[PDB]
Amino acid sequence: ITPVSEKKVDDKITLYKTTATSDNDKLNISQILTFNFIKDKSYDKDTLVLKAAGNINSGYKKPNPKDYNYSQFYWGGKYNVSVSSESNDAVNVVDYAPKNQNEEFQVQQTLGYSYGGDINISNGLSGGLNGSKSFSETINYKQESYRTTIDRKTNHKSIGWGVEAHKIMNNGWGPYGRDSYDPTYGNELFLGGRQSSSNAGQNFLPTHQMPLLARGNFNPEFISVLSHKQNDTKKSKIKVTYQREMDRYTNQWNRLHWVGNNYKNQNTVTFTSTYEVDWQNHTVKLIGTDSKETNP
């Protein structure tokens, strides 16, 4: 955790910034969190803009190339990120970015704070480079073939996002998804050729033609905005969760042709950090982490 930096921006706004990192290196999940507390003389709530960045590896490993009539590998089917507030009713999640479903290859947005408390989200990064807002923070991430959606359970105490395999192209064919189904060939998502004389373990889409999120890693950038009533003097807790759902893709030779299958979320890998937030001192302390895999 960096020591807090205090910056008087002008006679209305003072900003307090801390950066905190926590990671699990066995799971290859890293959280890089930027906490910006905004003290605005003209607004009677404290505002925290929390940017969640870092890494979630897909967990992909190559299939065994010697597998002859049946093979399989695990891949990054979906990434989940959430931020939740506990232990104080005077704290609420009030805004966040991205705000709407988005399947563009790159997500690039600015979240701006205006004197008096208004939050706006604009498309593109100019909004946080033109410096027109009293405070802004940007998100910038690649998610080619994947789709970001806001979780249905999002409410005043939690925001989460799902970044899910959505429209995957396989050597010009597709698009395919985690669920695609043909009665003859199964899910052809990462199948090499329907008739290939190759080994099962060498009858998959070559790794570099898979999406980066499927075989490599996701680099999340998400913003949560939390408000805290200035009257309240109590600390609060924030839990930040990064998660991958690992799917198992398989192929099998059935007499005349290959069949592909995708099993969803066969291993769920989760990393959570919990911070104590001091609103009076604009400081955060890491009080807990936890890691889980359902099927290592």
Ligand code: NI
């Ligand atoms: Ni779509």
